[PDB]
């Protein structure tokens, strides 16, 4: 029932890799410090996302067995997960406990950033529903690894090789849930259910980006490839 020495090892190693990301406080201090125009916020988003993808690629290469997969399957797994991982990490940041009144200003700054009304509602519904789950740092790290190692991605040639890498992560996540929240037995199924919500963000992503209230939508060359814009 408890984590085996192997599972604790995999867990601590996943956590250390995940924590090499840009710190939440760094992101929120900037946003909370002062109100920027839509033009400036779009520039902040593209620089944040470029750095996120760069760190995501590094975290992915350290996932056990990923480097043994077919080079074309590796590209499809990364391209297919980059948007979901950005929204999952943004939800983590959004839900970080801050001093009284700060998270309300954060929500106000994000609502007034330049994103269109059509995309604010599903975005905030996701962040709140993530918030209710009260996820630990390990749950966010394992869930990100599970999102990346999704065997059921379009343009994947060898699905079982991916399934074999994801299954030990699913098993660690389940045990973690059955220990951190014994009073909520659906917690594990409910985390996995939120992944189905993340997939919908990826399908309308190009449209969400182009509907930002700016005069010109400039992207970096790495984002052009990853976001298909």
């Amino acid at each position: 029932m408890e984590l085996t020495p192997d599972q604790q090892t995999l867990l601590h190693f996943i956590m250390d890799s995940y924590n090499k990301q840009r710190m939440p406080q760094e992101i929120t201090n900037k946003i909370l410090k002062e109100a920027f125009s839509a033009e400036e916020n779009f520039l902040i988003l593209t620089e944040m996302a470029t750095n996120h993808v760069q760190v995501l690629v590094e975290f992915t290469k350290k996932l056990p067995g990923f480097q043994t997969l077919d080079h074309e399957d590796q590209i499809a797994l990364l391209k297919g997960s980059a948007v979901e991982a950005m929204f999952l990490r943004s939800a983590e940041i959004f839900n970080k406990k801050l001093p009284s009144g700060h998270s309300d200003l954060l929500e106000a700054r994000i609502r007034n950033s330049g994103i269109s009304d059509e995309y604010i509602t599903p975005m905030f519904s996701f962040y709140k529903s993530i918030g209710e789950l009260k996820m630990t740092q390990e749950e966010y790290a394992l869930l990100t690894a599970i999102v990346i190692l999704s065997p059921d991605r379009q343009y994947i040639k060898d699905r079982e090789a991916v399934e074999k890498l994801q299954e030990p992560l699913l098993d660690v996540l389940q045990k973690l849930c059955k220990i951190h929240q014994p009073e909520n037995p659906q917690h594990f199924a409910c985390l996995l259910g939120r992944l189905t919500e993340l997939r919908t963000f990826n399908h309308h992503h190009a449209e969400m980006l182009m509907s930002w209230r700016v005069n010109d939508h400039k992207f970096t060359p790495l984002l052009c490839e990853i976001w298909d814009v």
Partner: peptide, 11 residues
């Protein structure tokens, strides 16, 4: 194509 992605993954 995805040449920047291919590069980052190989490197």
């Amino acid at each position: 194509d995805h040449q920047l992605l291919r590069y980052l993954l190989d490197k």
